[PDB]
Symmetry: D2
Subunit: 249 residues, 4 copies
């Protein structure tokens, strides 16, 4: 199976969790993969892990400030200049929130809006600049089940993830004439560092609320990134695919 | 090369032409054991002969049950389950459209589109569930439409029936996920099949140019989404409908 | 307050629950009200109740088979003939389902599809025929929260109520050029004969788990019918308004 | 008609357009109105216009930086101090975008996200702090049709307005236990300074694409704010009402 054969791919937040599982699955399927991480330390750790798994595969790693379009452009530009093209952009880096409304500070709301929305806008804009003249490409934006069904706390999380769905819808409709597809992915509860850090009572809570009686594995989200990036999904754009196993927050 | 549905016993309703027939081919290519349903025995015979030319060593069963009769659907689903010992995938793809102005929509026309597009999907999903529930495994795929989400400017029975399919998929998916059976919808935009061809090229030239992709989707582009959704790659996808419309808005 | 002053109104399922609460609120706001019921007995009971409340008000009552468009046309036609016009049509009559999928018979699925969807189509079609030449009117269709968020059982209920939302969207887009508005109302859990079952010991736990800690009252749905039928809602069409107090099935 | 009798109301962006039409309709319906505007000059102009219409009515006016929660709290706090309570908060201030994706600068995307989302979050948070102990109140957030159906350009506009819908959904579900309702309003194309200044070619396109063959008037949106703020809408929360006359971008 080589669903993304010879596709030049960038995965933001590709150092751990869903993004890292996607790096592996995309390399397994013939893609040329580059990853972004928050810090250079996280990037070095992930590149060393990928070097053990794939000793003959070259994987580029960068740590741009996702809130700065110039910093994202510098990193995206290096990938496009090394391979002469950019086929796939996955705006997967993201954070969550669970604070009760009264305890949501200005700083916390600004930060989740910055990373989850401005980070996605910057990545999609920089990918588009490298894809527009080639008149081909795929931009994948990671939303959440909370972007559709809301949440009971951490208002910045459904607000930012609903914005990602809205950005995906509008951008997809706008740039389809340049043969560039824009698709969203809205996961439910996934077994990563984002969810495994919670207290045991919250973990117990999730596991009883999940209709599948298990969290999804990062591979189950990464397999959807894989299909959506492949030419099999040539009819899918300006929409968000729910991958939540019927979980409802 | 690919074998995304290897050894999966699959039934495709409306598998004699358009999207369903393209799915029959793509599913056989990917290792599935395929059975098709068609509206008439003549359509079934034609499709089986076409598939026999393409795949001379492949056995494909064909049936023409009245989709509005659950006993007729159960008899056909039962024969497939009896022959292979299980049922892994059910695709409720058979459907029809409408474009009549509201004043000209007869009682008979509204009843018929509601019967085929909704009762036909309910009957197929119910009969599949009965053959899947003890195995605690399976995938049910229901074909909706872009009109089920964005409405239409005419033929009210078409968005009404296709929105019902999305609602059925959502509710059924939430209900039977505890039996490890996934229920997923597919909402196509405008697809190049017998459903959409008939108009002269002069009329169609301006229509195609106004489409966001400047072309209709091909039946293979919908069938490839059936393939992914039926595969173990979509293990996290249930109680939802995937839009495959190339940004087309009715 | 006379939000529907002199508006000739038909309310299907106006003999009890939401429909009956709407009959009272519409009479209070100056409308000329006619009600439909399943049986002649229900119609006689409701008309007598409205005579004790409003002795000087004339209310017409009919019991047409909602699955027969000719029977609905005969009743709608009599109202339009008596007042010379039809201003408001409320397709409020409906039923629910809670049977587990295996136990949903052909007959049960056919019946809920017939009453909840064909009944709404027939009422909307007959209203349209009496409104189209006047180039004014409002058609209100009662959906449900299950039409948007699904359900855990009784598949015919989300299937039929999602169809009502789809019919409302398509019909609204089609006939807005004739200055006829088509709007949906999606209630959550309302205190009527439809939810009047279980003893209080069992109910106490259920009510406590509801986001508002109570069901909605039929007046709370009828007040939304009132606004939507008024000229205040002149910009609202081809959409469904959620009146569920944040309840999620 | 006095749908919002004795209700202490704050309207952000109440100096012109929809917000100003709402100021008038809310005063007509018995509310105690306070307005916010971008500049002190706009506030002075609107207060003078309202003094000519209502010479005996006192209307407070403020121009806080909506991106600063402390500046919004200072203004909201003064209203709550003067009347001892806050009954209604309308987060109506907003801006639009129509730039092609390549021409959307970092600055433009940041600004629309700041005003349309952080401005709504700040207003809703400050209102909640003044409403939570009273265990009653209504927060109205202005989204847009583009938040549901996307757009063909100005990606910041559907992204920010979809975020407003997501914020409304999540916040509504979270604070309904404090008897505070959170509702959204999604207008189509409204005849205000936001749209009326466009070149004839763009105007022609709008008028052709509008199924009603006219734009909605600001009163048609303000009448929906009125109903949603009234006790008639007691069952409506954690949802967005479309007021678009079947217009689709
Ligand atoms: N884990 C879940 O249950 C869940 C639920 C729904 C949505 N999602 C979304 O899935 C995506 C991936 O999440 P995950 O669970 O794999 O998370 P993770 O914590 O396992 O990894 C997140 C990745 O994003 C990067 N990232 C985070 N904050 C960053 C910042 N400030 N700057 C730059 N990069 C940053 C990290 O470096 C890391 O590589 C996110 O968009 C998340 O919101 C996850
Ligand atoms: N083609 C499009 O533009 C379009 C758009 C949106 C939705 N869809 C949906 O896709 C599905 C497949 O459609 P298609 O375009 O391939 O159509 P098609 O006409 O090419 O084939 C339809 C198939 O369904 C079967 N079928 C139709 N009526 C039937 C009946 N009364 N009883 C039993 N079987 C019946 C036919 O035998 C045939 O095999 C349908 O559900 C259709 O509504 C298609
Ligand atoms: N009550 C709830 O919790 C709730 C929830 C969501 C949606 N709804 C919807 O609200 C609407 C009103 O329901 P309600 O709770 O007031 O119910 P109800 O049982 O109190 O009243 C139903 C009314 O519809 C009529 N009706 C029912 N079946 C009919 C048939 N076969 N033919 C003709 N008339 C028929 C009855 O005579 C009666 O007047 C329905 O469409 C229902 O689906 C109710
Ligand atoms: N007019 C339309 O076609 C339309 C379409 C859909 C949504 N909307 C939404 O409706 C709402 C009202 O818009 P309108 O058409 O009445 O606009 P308008 O331009 O007529 O008025 C906007 C108001 O918001 C204030 N405002 C704008 N930017 C601000 C800022 N930086 N800081 C503080 N206050 C600011 C202005 O002072 C003014 O009072 C907005 O949220 C807008 O996005 C309008």
């Amino acid at each position: 199976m080589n669903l993304v054969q010879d596709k030049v791919t960038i995965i933001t937040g590709g150092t751990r969790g869903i993004g890292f599982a996607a790096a592996k699955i995309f390399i397994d399927n013939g893609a040329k993969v580059s990853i972004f991480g928050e810090t250079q330390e996280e990037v070095d750790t992930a590149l060393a892990q990928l070097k053990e798994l794939y000793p003959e595969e070259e994987v580029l790693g960068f740590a741009p400030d996702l809130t700065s379009r110039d910093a994202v452009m510098a990193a995206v530009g290096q990938v496009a200049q090394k391979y002469g093209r950019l086929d796939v952009m996955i705006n997967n880096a993201g954070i969550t929130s669970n604070n009760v409304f009264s305890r949501v500070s200005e700083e916390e709301f600004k930060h989740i809006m910055d990373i989850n929305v401005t980070g996605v806008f910057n990545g999609a804009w920089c990918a588009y600049q490298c894809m527009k003249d080639a008149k081909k490409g795929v931009i994948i934006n990671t939303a959440s089940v909370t972007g559709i069904f809301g949440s009971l706390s951490g208002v910045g999380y459904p607000a930012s993830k609903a914005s990602v769905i809205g950005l995906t819808h509008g951008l997809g409709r706008e740039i389809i004439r340049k043969n560039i597809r824009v698709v969203g992915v809205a996961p439910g509860v996934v077994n990563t560092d984002m969810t495994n850090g919670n207290p045991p009572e919250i973990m117990e809570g999730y596991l009883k609320a999940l209709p599948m009686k298990r969290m999804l594995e990062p591979e189950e989200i990464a397999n959807v990134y894989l299909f959506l990036a492949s030419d099999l999904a040539s009819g899918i754009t300006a929409t968000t695919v729910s991958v939540d196993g019927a979980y409802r927050p």
